[PDB]
Amino acid sequence: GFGSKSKKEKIRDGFEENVVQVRRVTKVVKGGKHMRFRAIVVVGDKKGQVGVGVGKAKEVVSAVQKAAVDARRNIITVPMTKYLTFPHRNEADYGAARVMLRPAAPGTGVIAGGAVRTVLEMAGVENALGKQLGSNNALNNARATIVAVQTMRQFSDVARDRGIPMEELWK
Amino acid sequence: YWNINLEEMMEAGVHFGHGTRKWNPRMSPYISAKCKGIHIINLTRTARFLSEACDLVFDASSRGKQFLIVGTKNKAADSVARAAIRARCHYVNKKWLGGMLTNWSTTETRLHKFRDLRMEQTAGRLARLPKRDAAVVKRQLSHLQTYLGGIKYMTGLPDIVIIVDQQEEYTALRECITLGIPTICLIDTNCNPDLADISIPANDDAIASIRLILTKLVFAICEGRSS
Amino acid sequence: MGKDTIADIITCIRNADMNRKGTVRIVSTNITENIVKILLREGFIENARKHQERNKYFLVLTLRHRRNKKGPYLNTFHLKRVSRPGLRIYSNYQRIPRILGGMGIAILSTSRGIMTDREARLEGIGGEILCYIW
Amino acid sequence: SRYRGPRFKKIRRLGALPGLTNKRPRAGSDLRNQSRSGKRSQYRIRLEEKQKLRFHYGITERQLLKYVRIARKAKGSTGQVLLQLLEMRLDNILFRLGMAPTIPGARQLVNHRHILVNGRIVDIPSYRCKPQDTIMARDEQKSIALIQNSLDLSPREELPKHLTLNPFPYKGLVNQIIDSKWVGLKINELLVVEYYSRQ
Amino acid sequence: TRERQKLKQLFEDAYERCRNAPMEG
RNA sequence: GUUAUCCGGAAUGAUUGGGCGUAAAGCGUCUGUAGGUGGCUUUUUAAGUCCGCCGUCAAAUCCCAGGGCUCAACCCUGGACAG
Q: Which segments does the entry list as coiled coil (chain B)?
């Protein structure tokens, strides 16, 4: 109880935050019908470092930052080899949200649906195109991209895994 | 170096495994033989993984850390405490709480209260209040004495946790896997080598096998402090 | 011994390592022998051994791993058929795909033998794409 | 059209439109209300990169669709090539050479037929220049020294590396297509490119 | 800093849980 | 701007690209004709398949590169992958 949380908020230049949806989810009780706020926060620096997080609380801002503290303990790093794009195409479903990611030329800003585009514009990739096949959901969507960019391999570690010395690569 | 002769384990209760129709078959490229309703653990890969175990324990203390050991079984209850008073490590007495590693903020405040109640227990002002307050302080001090009596000397997380075999402490183990804290533990004949990332598969039916591997790692840690 | 002798080997590979078991026993026909010959030399697997059981020469095949992990092999193998029996696929030396840029290979049946994308792209020949792994 | 309109509105909304319609910074006696408070949808952000581009060059938006279709149609970084097909626009060059103070100034300065290019007059502001061109005045402009007034008040900012201004014989030429670093305006190519993906 | 140290520890252990499940025995 | 017509979005007819325990959906089960797919080795022809060359698929259109109208639209000259 020292006060004002100035040093303790950690001013968040390192991780920039945004919501991607704040739906009010509600439960009914004996007394009636009371609601809490479920916010989904995607945290990440533009270095290649993102992760989702849900939260719910009766306040809006405590749900956002509570989802952020859930989010900033959930980070993967993005395998993004070239001039801020992707090594190869990928698809990976989670639940019932399927996400096709596809690398792009460098003259192409990120084009995807709002959750996928949110976790990629926070991922610092600049050149991708990801269609979403399946759900209208936002959480399983974004988390499906996170699973869809964990399982993604560069050329250096595939060259290391196969044992092949090196060729067949322009750069 | 950290050797153990093959005959010292091969004589005692190390290959003296567990039940022959309870085996969890991720030991199918591991377990050597089966005799009389009891499994027979492969001792070559056992001692090699113990070589690796003492390499990665003595190296980790050579960096300079503090290790943790869980003690809960009541078949190996006090043997861990003997294996933790001399070895300087902090230890679980008899019983575990789900949350002593991952929810350690409330456990930390619970150590504020436990530290203050030990400060009142030592100070001699316990006999001021009548049997009500003394009864309550003895009860909560008894429960924190059950859990937090053996880990007063810890702030923060350890580096390597060595646990009572597999069964009673999947809770503490899964808190370690959530925290990422590497653990090197004991495996029965019917458990997972992939829970922790290196462990030491040997039966723990023998108290002398438990005293063997634990005593081995106790001198590993103390020689880690030897600097 | 079903309908396909190539979904035989391939489905034994997927079903082999999705249960993390690093050992395959399959029949050794000519095209299976050729696939494991052009597959051990490309770093996916470790060893292929012929032997006999009732004078029936089989292939036991050792898969790759790594060390003691959550799963001891990191890169999931991801084998896939293409030219199904009843839907044959055929490619020129134009269509022949660079799988994921090259991180996968497309083993295919030339008039020479069966090659990879390296050994059928330099030839300029084309043929029936058996399957591509990645 | 031209849009020919109130323009500090567009500077307060879009941020400071550099050079175009002002060297004077906005709101010399203004802005003392209207808290944004931080709520702006992302479509508003990409839309403000459209109009940060569209007002800074004075284009019709249909013509900007035309330049995006040519920019996709060419080979290379479409986020950059859009800012090559809108830098070697003629009145942007006459702005950048300081032949006029503002880009409506350059557009009107080329509407009334005061520019010879390679010795031939060009009456149209949307003319796209080439490498190794020649940009001069009119023969009457040594008697009509309006260009010399603009070159008098100009030379705070010098030139980017395509231009070569000759002092009294008033000739400016571009050595090569302008580089991205060379582009004067500061904006994200990806934001604008992404916006037109829908079409 | 503490989180980074923890991560480094985990890496060390995973590598220590990477060197010798291969070979060894 | 509204309306109408068409495509997209629509993986909402699905080869690329869906499903059938309970959401729409497995015949009540079985025999079997036509038809579909099919074990292994060796040999032969090459119908499919692949490679080379050649002919043709008018001109105009689309793509590339030049050129002309003050630019563009449009016009013109040459070239060609596909297939």
A: none
Among the candidates B86, B117, B148, a domain finishes at B148
Residues in CB range of E10: below 8 A, 6 or more apart: B180, B181, B182
Residue of chain C nearest B25, judged by CA positions = C21
Task: Indicate whether B78 and B183 sit together in one domain.
Answer: yes
Residue C110: Cβ-neighbour burial (10 angstroms; 0-12, 13-18, 19+): middle
The residue that minimises its CA distance to C1' of F16 is: C82
Q: Which of A158, A164, A169 to mutate to test the interface with C (most CBs of C within 10 A)?
A: A158
Q: Which residue is nearest to nucleotide F11 (CA to C1')?
A: A133
Task: For chain B, say whether C66 makes contact (Cβ under 8 Å).
Answer: no
Preferred mutation among C66, C67, C70, C73 to probe E, highest tally of E CBs within 10 A: C67
Reported resolution in A? 3.7
Over the range E2-16, which residues count as b (16 or more CB within 10 Å of their CB) and which as e? eeeebeebbebbbeb
Query: How many structural domains compose chain B?
Result: 2
Question: Is 1.10.1740.10 the CATH classification of the domain at C77-134?
Answer: no
- Domain C1-76 adopts which CATH fold? Ribosomal Protein S8; Chain: A, domain 1 (3.30.1370)
Q: Which residues contact D72 (CB under 8 A, 6 or more apart)?
A: D78
Q: Are A141 and A125 in contact (CB under 8 A)?
A: no
Which domains are delineated in chain D? 1-86+184-199 (1.10.1050.10), 87-183 (3.10.290.10)
Looking at the complex, report in whole angstroms how far the Cα of residue C70 sits from the nearest Cα belonging to chain E: 10
Experimental technique behind these coordinates = cryo-EM
Q: Are strands A128-134 and A97-103 parallel, antiparallel or unpaired?
A: antiparallel
In this complex, is the C-beta atom of A11 within 8 Å of any C-beta atom belonging to chain C? no
Residue of chain C whose alpha carbon sits nearest to that of B27: C21
Task: Supply the CATH classification number for the domain A78-171.
Answer: 3.30.230.10
Quick check: A141 CB within 7 A of strand F? no
Domain ranges of chain C: 1-76, 77-134
Separation between Cα atoms, residue D97 and residue D100, nearest integer Å: 8
Q: d(Cα D116, Cα D121) in Å, to the nearest integer?
A: 4
Domain assignment of residue B211, given as a range: 29-96+160-227
Chains that touch D (3 or more CB pairs under 8 A): A
